Symmetry: C7
Subunit: 71 residues, 7 copies
């Protein structure tokens, strides 16, 4: 919420549920454990709206795939 570091908002959501929106249209929801200046994120217990059936204990998402993150 400092006016020059929009990614501070991901720091203020560490260990909360977030929803990462990818460019292809996928949605990955999970517990945000980490992020970096590329917008790579570590998501704990992640689920994709798409496949439903499968759950991912730990998922690491390459930041250049990212549309936006809903905090």
């Amino acid at each position: 919420m400092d006016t020059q570091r929009p990614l501070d908002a991901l720091g203020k959501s560490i260990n909360t549920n977030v929803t990462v929106y990818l460019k292809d249209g996928k949605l990955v929801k999970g517990r945000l454990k980490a992020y970096d200046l590329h917008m790579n994120v570590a998501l704990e217990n992640a689920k994709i709206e798409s496949d439903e059936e499968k759950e991912f204990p730990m998922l690491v998402v390459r930041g250049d795939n990212v549309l936006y993150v809903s905090l």
Copy 2:
């Protein structure tokens, strides 16, 4: 304003609402809370005029997705 820092026009619009046009045709509307030189933006109470229904309390939009931004 300053002819060499165009991203300062975002400066003149912080804590107001702005429309962020993305490359994939999407239009994101939100309260502008932060921005860096990647054109990453933080939007408060965001709305995509695609789905229009849900307000997102906080969207962090990755910069390379931005087409142009309406201040």
Copy 3:
């Protein structure tokens, strides 16, 4: 005018009326207020050849969307 700095041509055209060509076939017209070495540009009173009706008092285009800028 300088042979190694082509974007000086945009510095010569500040507050003149320019047309920005984007990769996706769009035409963004307006008053060039600012630019940077990424080819970001701030346009005052921007209109897009597509929408016709709506003008934009301030529009910041992200540079890697730019095909060429006409002066």
Copy 4:
């Protein structure tokens, strides 16, 4: 597990079966042996689950193809 280094998840998973989802839609599962900050990965005995039969003793994946890696 540090909040500012999501790629450290990968280090905790050396010599462990991980699944590399690519932008293509391909799936590549194998034993993680090495990784860089580009998210290039070294994969011992990988198996693209599209072509199934092919055995890849050693596979090196270019990071910028990585959609996400499931640990």
Copy 5:
């Protein structure tokens, strides 16, 4: 001319008419006024196969340039 520096060919062609080929199949021809290391070019009196008195082309759009 120098073997390590192919962009000097643009320099050897300043104020020469050239043709700039873009990835999308467009062609832009005109007078070469300036170029940089991203391969951004400025073109005088440019025309795409209207005429633009000055056309600044972003260098990552470039397929190749015809000298």
Copy 6:
């Protein structure tokens, strides 16, 4: 086999045959003579399994085309 340098598995494969898959779908086999950190590779007597007919005494591939290299 060092955990932080997944491209070392390439160095351990010089003067040997390799298979470079390319994002466009091509498969390119040849003896690996040289590589760098962009993943540009030099191929000796290379063969595109699609083109079949043509052989290449020397092929250098630009890394940003690499999907993955099967050693």
Copy 7:
């Protein structure tokens, strides 16, 4: 020849004819005059195996279009 600089095979082949394939399929062959670490190349008397009719006395190819170069 040198294991870390695949771009030296490009230096070994200057003032000879080479073929530059491009991501759009193009075959561009010509007399190699110069290259840089981006893999930009300047070719003398270049010919596209597509257009056939028109030869270019001097062509400068932006390296990010290169797929591979034959010798």
